[PDB]
Design an enzyme around this catalytic site. Structure first.
Site, mmCIF file in Angstrom:
data_model
loop_
_atom_site.group_PDB
_atom_site.id
_atom_site.type_symbol
_atom_site.label_atom_id
_atom_site.label_comp_id
_atom_site.label_asym_id
_atom_site.label_seq_id
_atom_site.Cartn_x
_atom_site.Cartn_y
_atom_site.Cartn_z
ATOM 1 N N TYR A 192 -11.443 1.568 4.302
ATOM 2 C CA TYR A 192 -10.359 1.448 3.301
ATOM 3 C C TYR A 192 -9.845 2.788 2.817
ATOM 4 O O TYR A 192 -8.701 2.873 2.408
ATOM 5 C CB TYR A 192 -10.758 0.590 2.075
ATOM 6 C CG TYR A 192 -10.989 -0.874 2.395
ATOM 7 C CD1 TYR A 192 -12.088 -1.269 3.147
ATOM 8 C CD2 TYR A 192 -10.111 -1.872 1.930
ATOM 9 C CE1 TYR A 192 -12.319 -2.608 3.448
ATOM 10 C CE2 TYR A 192 -10.335 -3.224 2.221
ATOM 11 C CZ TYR A 192 -11.451 -3.582 2.979
ATOM 12 O OH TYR A 192 -11.725 -4.904 3.290
ATOM 13 N N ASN A 236 -12.424 -12.563 -0.655
ATOM 14 C CA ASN A 236 -11.794 -13.651 0.097
ATOM 15 C C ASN A 236 -12.022 -14.980 -0.618
ATOM 16 O O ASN A 236 -12.830 -15.056 -1.547
ATOM 17 C CB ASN A 236 -12.408 -13.751 1.489
ATOM 18 C CG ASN A 236 -11.838 -12.722 2.458
ATOM 19 O OD1 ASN A 236 -10.738 -12.191 2.262
ATOM 20 N ND2 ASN A 236 -12.595 -12.451 3.534
ATOM 21 N N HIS A 295 -4.715 -8.897 6.733
ATOM 22 C CA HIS A 295 -4.167 -9.350 5.447
ATOM 23 C C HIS A 295 -2.773 -8.832 5.227
ATOM 24 O O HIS A 295 -2.382 -8.566 4.087
ATOM 25 C CB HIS A 295 -5.087 -8.948 4.291
ATOM 26 C CG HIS A 295 -6.447 -9.624 4.333
ATOM 27 N ND1 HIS A 295 -6.731 -10.744 3.621
ATOM 28 C CD2 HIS A 295 -7.607 -9.314 5.054
ATOM 29 C CE1 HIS A 295 -7.997 -11.125 3.875
ATOM 30 N NE2 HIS A 295 -8.536 -10.246 4.738
HETATM 31 C C1 HDD Z 1 -14.661 -2.001 8.653
HETATM 32 C C2 HDD Z 1 -13.560 -2.717 8.658
HETATM 33 C C3 HDD Z 1 -13.455 -3.872 7.732
HETATM 34 C C4 HDD Z 1 -14.423 -4.939 7.467
HETATM 35 C C5 HDD Z 1 -15.806 -5.178 8.036
HETATM 36 C C6 HDD Z 1 -13.666 -5.735 6.475
HETATM 37 N N1 HDD Z 1 -12.430 -5.281 6.158
HETATM 38 FE FE1 HDD Z 1 -11.067 -5.967 4.748
HETATM 39 N N2 HDD Z 1 -9.762 -4.622 5.271
HETATM 40 C C7 HDD Z 1 -9.972 -3.595 6.152
HETATM 41 C C8 HDD Z 1 -11.087 -3.333 6.840
HETATM 42 C C9 HDD Z 1 -12.295 -4.166 6.876
HETATM 43 C C10 HDD Z 1 -8.827 -2.598 6.280
HETATM 44 C C11 HDD Z 1 -8.323 -2.346 7.698
HETATM 45 O O1 HDD Z 1 -9.214 -1.300 5.800
HETATM 46 C C12 HDD Z 1 -7.836 -3.187 5.298
HETATM 47 C C13 HDD Z 1 -6.379 -3.288 5.781
HETATM 48 C C14 HDD Z 1 -5.484 -2.741 4.653
HETATM 49 C C15 HDD Z 1 -6.460 -2.128 3.688
HETATM 50 O O2 HDD Z 1 -6.213 -1.561 2.628
HETATM 51 O O3 HDD Z 1 -7.797 -2.319 4.148
HETATM 52 C C16 HDD Z 1 -8.479 -4.502 4.864
HETATM 53 C C17 HDD Z 1 -7.776 -5.380 4.102
HETATM 54 C C18 HDD Z 1 -8.376 -6.479 3.310
HETATM 55 C C19 HDD Z 1 -7.675 -7.282 2.264
HETATM 56 C C20 HDD Z 1 -6.250 -7.185 1.800
HETATM 57 C C21 HDD Z 1 -6.311 -6.347 0.516
HETATM 58 C C22 HDD Z 1 -4.908 -6.309 -0.014
HETATM 59 O O4 HDD Z 1 -4.447 -7.371 -0.481
HETATM 60 O O5 HDD Z 1 -4.234 -5.244 0.070
HETATM 61 C C23 HDD Z 1 -8.700 -8.213 1.812
HETATM 62 C C24 HDD Z 1 -8.645 -9.293 0.750
HETATM 63 C C25 HDD Z 1 -9.856 -7.823 2.622
HETATM 64 N N3 HDD Z 1 -9.640 -6.856 3.531
HETATM 65 C C26 HDD Z 1 -11.160 -8.476 2.424
HETATM 66 C C27 HDD Z 1 -12.368 -8.361 3.237
HETATM 67 C C28 HDD Z 1 -13.562 -9.234 3.012
HETATM 68 C C29 HDD Z 1 -13.804 -10.328 2.022
HETATM 69 C C30 HDD Z 1 -14.439 -8.748 4.067
HETATM 70 C C31 HDD Z 1 -15.803 -9.207 4.394
HETATM 71 C C32 HDD Z 1 -16.725 -9.260 3.462
HETATM 72 C C33 HDD Z 1 -13.687 -7.669 4.732
HETATM 73 N N4 HDD Z 1 -12.473 -7.438 4.204
HETATM 74 C C34 HDD Z 1 -14.243 -6.914 5.851
#
Ligand code: HDD
Ligand code: HDD
Ligand code: HDD
Ligand SMILES: [Ca+2]
Ligand SMILES: [Ca+2]
Ligand SMILES: [Ca+2]
Lengths: 672, 318, 674
Positions: free
Chosen positions: C349, C135, C62
């Site tokens: 996160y 999402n 994202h």
């Molecule tokens: C275990 C790892 C993992 C899993 C299974 C998911 N994510 Fe995630 N997501 C992350 C690890 C992550 C992350 C790497 O931790 C991020 C990158 C930047 C942050 O703050 O968290 C992230 C970013 C991130 C953002 C951007 C937030 C922003 O605008 O700053 C969104 C909307 C989502 N994710 C949504 C989801 C949804 C709807 C998931 C399934 C239900 C999902 N993520 C599963």
């Protein structure tokens, strides 16, 4: 003040996460009462992640230190010599923060290590932060900033085993000093009582480098900064400093904390020697050379203002640990010189904050913030705490009307480089021949010390050099010491079983200079804060009576009194078990306690006597108030700074003179 | 052992980090008494390096010292554990050990009164296995979430950062007296165990109950105990205080010297082994890190020999 | 303005260093006028050091995205279902910040990539920050958090050459999809118009996971978050999204910015489906499984309140780039479930912010700060901005009188885990067999799309799979698609010259579900902010007159009008050289301009191409003024076509055209498989 605004109060209220959700933090969330901890336990992970990331890299040098808040007050309108705004009016007050430190030791090392000491002062002026990053010694080891890691590697612990901590007493340090003769002057200072000051309050501060004062008309003069202690000059003796390191690694930081808390905030007169540009090479040396002082006989001191520290920090990490000084923090009315040591520092202090802070926004930390608005086009970076409203952060612009505007000599009170400065010649990696005399000023310093002071310095060198394993380094060391003084080399050689080389009189002379001796600097101008240990007993009600009576008298004169006995009780501050002579500037036995000085499970064998004996041997005023004690302690009744009176009032009066004298130096043996 | 990463500077000309021959003794200046130039890359690369030499000290056990050695298994222990380093009589595994105090910063004294660390890495042929232990068999607290509370209380008071490397202050005793779980480790720390004569003269303990697991999936509960072959010995407190002043490096120097002189220290690596059914059979809970299993209830089994016999080449890197 | 306290004004004043010393920053200090620059130039070094360190790591996923501030308003006191304070009174208002994003692409990739989209919302509640990290698609690709890096590695660019940017159209992604059949449901969503939304404002938000609502009395219910857009549902067509990516990489962020700036801030109803704990396996699947939706037919929506975004950020880096969301930002009244995808996110996160911020004090950034007091014993760390007064930061203590006090279910409004939750059984790395049906729900989704919508999906798959080089992977893809629908496998197989495997009907069915179709969701409920391009000419003063009258009439209804001509002047907004059909929702030619339909001022055939592209992409198109056949014939646009307009009367033209903008897309212009 940026610091009030960032204070956080936790004297009431329920525990919350960092985002304000009320939580608990005492038990982990588990699957069953005897079960595994759950990943979903956010309370656990936020708390432990924070803890896991608490530490930051220590300062690369001066890692051990302590700070305090205060005020600087100008004595005059100094516009006739500098355009600096904090100096432009009689009585003008500017907030300050000062951090004192040792140099070589890591952040948990002892305050009373033999070392150069830092004395760094931030003036939060109305035209920006101005930092003077000084030491308690007016000259530095090396002549070019590029040699700094060489110096520091050699004096810091050997890199295979990281031994020894916070000490020049090892081969590599003396190898460097003996191969790099520029080090001699600062070495002589460090080996004197200046290496082991009695406290941060009993040392002076020096900017070391020649700087410029620049007037609004563009003219400049050359200056040296000197902060003159109002508390007087005082040192430990070496054996005392060694014991102190073990008994109280925090001795100096506690001394400063306590002086401030009791309303005895330390003071310095902030002074300069001021000379003309034409005098850069007039005094027998080059004013660009940071290994040289301007003897006071050639340029007297001008008192610019009063520096007083009077407030302790609230959180040590946030204020003291995070303060980030830079000689690059300069203000209009001050300029640099072409001192190649100063030149390189300018680079180092900006860069090294990246290491400590982990990101480029270190000036936004409350302790680092200025006390005036900030207008610039610096943007983004990790840890950006501002929200900038100007969406056209480039110059030149029309879209933000040309703001921020350029400041210079003729607009917006801008900093400007002294307009008289020039450069000429080849682009060279060459040392100026004007820097080559490494030995005459060390000799000047040595000459200016009293006989017992000269003995202490010889004895410091005997101590350290005797610990150097290499026969080759020891010989190289004597070669250099001998170019300073044949007598020094002879006396030091005597202790290490080598013969000094033949006299080499190229740099010998008999000249002296005022204001560099501690012992010759006279009795202390005040005795407030000094510590008096009264050794007593619980077994005699008379002993506790005498103690209490002394206490009343001594405390009214500002002295810190500690009554010591076998066990604690009303009127007794400290047990014999935790007591030591290093905790006192003077020691009094109340005669009703004579019995202890002749075994107990309450303190180690012979402790009461040892305290009295150590205090005597280290030159302190000692007394008995009520004299077979003196026999047991082998202390002469008639000795200077030995007191024996039954008269409470008479004793107090005489003993208080002893505390002013501070050390009775006749108790130390001298070479032939 | 780490030979492949060693860099030798006993010969040759000075180079930058990209191998260009240079000097590093004089700054480039506009004229012999002039200002230093920004184009002086020799100066900036050297000073930038220096400016960035330091890393954060460990949040606890900051003060310590280490050495390399070898572990040799006394038997094929397949009948209690599938652990590969324990699967043949005489099997050798390289180790590295770091010993430490707990509360003090870098540079604080070796001979402060404290819990001591005894952390051992076995570079096994199926992966690195670490036993991160202390010289005292029990810990102050019963739940990991309380660690920062314990550590804040025993580290220097946060307004003035006094006192260094010492529990001798109000906050620590406040915590100890409000959190009675601390009593056991407190009594150990207040004994001679808080001021050991050297790292070689103390034992190491995993503290926690762990499990040995056989290839068939059956398990047993174990406590690790490294038993010193040098004997047990302490300082007396007054001595430890003077030593903290005369030689802050006392323990690291002791270890360094014993290794150089060919008297590398040795420990028997032992376990107490008990059944899963014995988790609460001894009048306490084996999941409780404030408890020991009295040796009267479960004898020690000697698994192998740990010997430290090689000092590091660069303290920082290793 | 929520963050006013942290704003820095530079509309006046002299340049200073960061420590307040006035300086200049335009010329370096040199030894002589043609000399070398001096190291003592601190003005230079502080400025360039700052610049050199401006960048921080982009988000691991994202990375490409845009944010805005707003308000949430509760429709009721929801104490009957949750203890959450922000939901405890009718009309209660809470500030919010929302960031929208694509998922796969880096910073600087295009808004209109085909992808899942992020919809992350922070509620700055009076009991702490509460984040719903959602999402625009209600289901996720995978069933366990531990597989996240496998998914993301597979869909991100190949790691030898970092190709292709922001696209699933490559071997590794389709290899993963075909080997990990859980991916099918989200894949079918992403291959639909949901993969290419018309704007952030025209998509919904989903929490994806089942969460719990927990009452003050400790009882709980299972919930799914659904943010239903008040702007309607709308998509691009693929060819349009491709051109947009090149003509305006910033399309969605510009659309959001502009809508807010014009006083048209977008709105969603914040809703939940609520069900009992006893219904975790009652609907034919497991509520712990994030690849499943609860069909609306089994659980209707409760509208909790109104979300409105109405204020753009002041500094994008400070607010949008630095906002750090966490599903761990939870408040009393809400709890987690044992969804193994959710469970692992809780870890990630918190950890990932260390990477982005470079230090542990990221919650102190203005955008991450709560709007209530903080009382805890967290201390120090790089970038520590607080000066803590409490010098006894440990529990338990007497020296600070037992403060801060522990908060829990009974005291201090503490968070508490739903007390009815339990665990039982072996400690296992095993997948629940209740998670095993990967195909019935993708088929339910596909069944619920209109015929032309199903064609679009098949065409998206034909597009991407045709770009997969490996014949084995392509064959493995058809194997999975065929388990969802034989017809889909056959129709996709036809484009790639393989044969579909034989029908395997285990998971086939004909059931449908409401609320998932875009094309079947009806005319938009509002046309405000939609874009009308008026193609005109400077040759004819009548063309510019018609254009002005038309503008006046359309702007009255809140449409965004752009007049296009050869060159700019008063009343003309854009030149043909910069104009493109992707810039408009509707295209009108003024009949004064008929002659345009070769100049050094724009590429050959451009005015016509804009009209023709608009028509081919399904947009409403017309000719205003009365003379239409010249333009319509040149374009090959039939005069009686649906969504093709021709009237002399401005008022009448606009009334018909406005119906077409509401209909949005004329789907009869697209060929269907026979
Ligand atoms: C275990 C790892 C993992 C899993 C299974 C998911 N994510 Fe995630 N997501 C992350 C690890 C992550 C992350 C790497 O931790 C991020 C990158 C930047 C942050 O703050 O968290 C992230 C970013 C991130 C953002 C951007 C937030 C922003 O605008 O700053 C969104 C909307 C989502 N994710 C949504 C989801 C949804 C709807 C998931 C399934 C239900 C999902 N993520 C599963
Ligand atoms: C080119 C390298 C270099 C050179 C030649 C010097 N220093 Fe320095 N000094 C540093 C590089 C440095 C540093 C590595 O940049 C430090 C470590 C942490 C910091 O902020 O700056 C520092 C720290 C530091 C501190 C601690 C400030 C504080 O309390 O935080 C003091 C008092 C000094 N120095 C004083 C001096 C004096 C009086 C010098 C000779 C005239 C001197 N330094 C030469
Ligand atoms: C939940 C936090 C926590 C808890 C409850 C403990 N520790 Fe720990 N320990 C750490 C968190 C930690 C740490 C902050 O993660 C350190 C600091 C540096 C590092 O690598 O880990 C650490 C360092 C550390 C070291 C230094 C290792 C080295 O030489 O590098 C030793 C020997 C121990 N610990 C031993 C223990 C023992 C025997 C414990 C009780 C059974 C214990 N720790 C409980
Ligand atoms: Ca050495
Ligand atoms: Ca305390
Ligand atoms: Ca690929």
């Amino acid at each position: 003040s940026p610091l009030a605004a960032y204070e956080v109060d936790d004297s009431t209220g329920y525990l919350t996460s960092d985002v304000g959700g009320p939580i608990q933090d005492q038990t982990s969330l588990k699957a069953g009462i005897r079960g595994p901890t759950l990943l979903e336990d956010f309370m656990f992970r936020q708390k432990i992640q924070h803890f896991d990331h608490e530490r930051v890299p220590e300062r690369a040098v001066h890692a051990r230190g302590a700070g305090a808040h205060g005020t600087f007050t100008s004595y005059a309108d100094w516009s006739n010599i500098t355009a600096a705004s904090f100096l432009n009016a009689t009585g003008k007050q500017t907030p300050v923060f000062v951090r004192f430190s040792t140099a070589a030791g890591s952040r948990g090392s002892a305050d009373t290590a033999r070392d150069v000491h830092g004395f760094a002062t931030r003036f939060y002026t109305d035209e920006g932060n101005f930092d003077i990053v000084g030491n308690n010694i007016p000259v530095f080891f090396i002549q070019d900033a590029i040699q700094f890691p060489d110096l520091i590697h050699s004096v810091k612990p050997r890199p295979d085993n990281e031994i020894p901590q916070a000490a020049t007493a090892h081969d590599s340090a003396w190898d460097f000093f003996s191969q790099q003769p520029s080090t001699m002057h600062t070495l002589f200072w460090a080996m004197s009582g200046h290496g082991i000051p009695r406290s941060y309050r009993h040392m002076d501060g020096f900017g070391v480098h020649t700087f410029r004062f620049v007037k609004d008309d563009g003219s400049s003069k050359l200056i040296k900064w000197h902060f003159k202690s109002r508390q007087g000059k005082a040192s430990l003796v070496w054996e005392e400093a060694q014991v102190l390191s073990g008994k109280n690694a925090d001795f100096h930081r506690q001394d400063l904390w306590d002086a401030i808390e009791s309303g005895n905030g330390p003071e310095w007169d902030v002074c300069v020697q001021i000379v003309d540009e034409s005098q850069a090479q007039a005094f027998g040396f080059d004013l660009l050379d940071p290994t040289k002082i301007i003897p006071e006989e050639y340029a007297p001191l001008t008192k610019l203002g009063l520096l007083k520290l009077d407030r302790n920090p609230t959180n040590y990490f946030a204020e003291t640990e995070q303060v980030m000084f830079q000689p690059g923090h300069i203000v209009r009315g001050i300029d640099f010189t072409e001192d190649p040591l100063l030149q390189g520092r300018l680079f180092s202090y900006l860069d090294t904050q990246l290491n400590r802070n982990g990101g480029p926004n270190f000036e936004q930390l409350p302790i680092n913030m200025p006390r005036v608005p900030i207008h610039n086009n610096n943007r983004d970076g990790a840890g950006q705490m501002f929200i900038h409203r100007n969406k056209y952060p480039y110059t030149p612009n029309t879209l933000n009307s040309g703001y921020p505007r350029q400041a210079n000599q003729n607009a917006g009170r801008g900093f400007f480089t002294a307009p008289g400065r020039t450069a000429s010649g080849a682009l060279v990696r060459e040392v100026s021949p004007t820097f080559n005399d490494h030995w005459s000023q060390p000799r000047l310093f040595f000459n200016s010390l009293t006989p017992v002071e000269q003995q202490f310095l010889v004895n410091a060198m005997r101590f350290e050099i005797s610990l150097v394993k290499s026969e080759e380094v020891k010989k190289n060391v004597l070669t250099q010491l001998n170019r300073v003084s044949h007598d020094v080399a002879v006396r030091v050689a005597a202790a290490i079983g080598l013969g000094a080389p033949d006299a080499d009189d190229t740099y010998y002379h008999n000249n002296k200079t005022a204001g560099v001796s501690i012992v010759g600097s006279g009795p202390l101008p005040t005795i407030k804060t000094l510590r008096v240990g009264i050794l007593a007993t619980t077994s005699e009600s008379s002993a506790l009576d005498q103690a209490a009576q002394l206490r009343t008298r001594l405390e009214k004169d500002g002295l810190v009194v500690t009554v010591v006995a076998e066990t604690l009780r009303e009127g007794v501050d400290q047990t014999y078990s935790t007591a030591d002579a290093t905790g006192f500037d003077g020691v009094v036995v109340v005669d009703g306690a004579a019995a202890l000085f002749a075994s107990s499970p309450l303190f180690p064998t012979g402790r009461p006597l040892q305290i009295f004996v150590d205090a005597y041997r280290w030159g302190k005023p000692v007394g008995v108030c009520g004299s077979e004690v003196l026999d047991a302690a082998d202390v002469p009744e008639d000795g200077d700074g030995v007191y024996s009176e039954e008269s409470v009032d008479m004793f107090v009066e005489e003993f208080e003179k002893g505390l002013a004298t501070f050390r009775f130096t006749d108790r130390f043996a001298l070479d032939s």
